[PDB]
Amino acid sequence: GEIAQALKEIAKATKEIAWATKEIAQALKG
Amino acid sequence: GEIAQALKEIAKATKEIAWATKEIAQALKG
Amino acid sequence: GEIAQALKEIAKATKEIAWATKEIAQALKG
Amino acid sequence: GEIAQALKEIAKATKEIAWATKEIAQALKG
Amino acid sequence: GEIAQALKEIAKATKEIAWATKEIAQALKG
Amino acid sequence: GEIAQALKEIAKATKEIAWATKEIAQALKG
After folding, report:
1. Residues of A in contact with B24 (CB under 8 A)
2. Does B16 sit within 8 Å of D11, measured CB to CB?
3. I need a labelling partner for E30 at 20 to 30 A (CA). Which of B8, C8, C17, F21 fits?
């Protein structure tokens, strides 16, 4: 579990960063 | 061991980046 | 396995972050 | 070995990104 | 296998994020 | 091998993102 669980948590957080970064890009374009 | 500890630290830091990036998005959409 | 699935999700999200970050850079450059 | 060392370096750098992203958010919020 | 391929893709995408983030910093400096 | 090499490349790129993100923070705080 520990290594697999940490990688799953990194995956979830990285997906959230991706979405927020897309929102920033969209805001800056208008 | 060391690998599991490092991955747990990456998971924690990535979650913090996700939170902060969401705050940036909200500020710019605000 | 679980490790491969998580890493593939991280790869996909990191590509999305790269694209969105490039869009942010282009928006700020005008 | 090498894998653990690289992951430790990634952990340190991601913590620094977390700090800087929080600083960006606060600066934008005034 | 897939694990190595995903890490190679993460490396490439992270290099692109590094470039784009440097461009953002330069744009914000004028 | 391939996995260690990709992780070393991720470590370098992540350190460069940390540098650039700090530069962004400093620019906004100016």
Report:
1. 20, 24
2. no
3. C17
Query: How far is it, in rounded angstroms, from Cα E18 to Cα E24?
Result: 10
Delimit the domains of chain C by residue range: 1-30
Q: What angle is formed at CA C5 by the lines to CA C2 and CA C6, rounded to 5 degrees?
A: 85
- For residue C25, what is the nearest residue in chain A, using CA coordinates? A25
DSSP at E29: T
Residues 1-30 of E with CB under 8 A from F: 3-4, 7-8, 10-11, 14-15, 17-18, 21-22, 24-25, 28-29
Residues F27, E28: contact at Cβ < 8 Å? yes
Cβ–Cβ under 8 Å, residues B10 and A12: no
- Could you say which of B11, B21, B28 has the minimum Cβ distance to residue A6? B11
Rounded distance, CA A21 to CA C16, Å? 9
What would you report as the CA-atom Rg of chain F, rounded to the nearest whole angstrom? 13
